Design a protein around this ligand. Structure first.
Ligand SMILES: Cn1cnc(N)c2ncnc1-2
Ligand SMILES: [Zn+2]
Length: 188
């Protein structure tokens, strides 16, 4: 039915729990948003479920994505992570998270809150994309393109427009659930 169409055809409870409890569900906590963003940056070349299943390994490797701690990681820390089990052993991908954490800190210095910075891109409330079929879905748009360009100036890496669009859907700044999906959030 609708949930199958909405949730990328999966019957995996890990992915379904993610669909129901995280994906497209508005998230306002700054450190939690950073986490989703950093995980999205690890996707390219792999399946998304692959990254999802590596989440706990990443949390251990990156101090539960606490940006103050991640931003201080050294080349020697990355050397160590290249053989840490069950994260993606892609050196630029791992280095990118450290750079992202530095950029988060710069944003917070200028704007107070990474969450307030991000939510501004949708005027403070979730944009319902109003999809009816999975075939309606696009992979990038103007807002994601702008946010991608803007993050670069603060030192974020591995976050192109398509990747940022995926993050907006995941964080619930965009609601990409189908109209009849039982997990579609209510809006006001
Ligand atoms: C298919 N899919 C579902 N959820 C996400 N967060 C994703 N990121 C990249 N691709 C994704
Ligand atoms: Zn859904």
């Amino acid at each position: 039915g609708a949930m199958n169409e909405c949730a990328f055809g999966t019957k995996d409870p890990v992915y379904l729990n993610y669909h129901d409890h995280v994906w497209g569900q508005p998230l306002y906590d700054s450190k939690a948003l950073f986490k989703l963003l950093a995980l999205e940056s690890q996707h390219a070349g792999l399946s998304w479920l692959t990254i999802l299943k590596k989440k706990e390994a990443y949390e251990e490797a990156f101090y539960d994505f606490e940006p103050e701690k991640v931003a201080q990681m050294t080349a020697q820390d990355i050397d160590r992570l290249m053989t840490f089990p069950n994260i993606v052993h892609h050196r630029k991908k791992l280095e990118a998270i450290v750079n992202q954490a530095q950029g988060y800190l710069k944003i917070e210095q200028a704007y107070g809150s990474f969450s307030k910075f991000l939510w501004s891109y949708v005027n403070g409330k979730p944009k319902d994309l109003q999809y009816e079929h999975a075939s309606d879905r696009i992979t990038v748009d103007d807002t994601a393109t702008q946010l991608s360009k803007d993050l670069k100036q603060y030192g974020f890496k591995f976050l192109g427009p398509v990747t940022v669009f995926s993050f907006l859907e995941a964080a619930g700044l965009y609601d990409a659930h189908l109209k009849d999906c039982p997990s579609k959030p209510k809006h006001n």
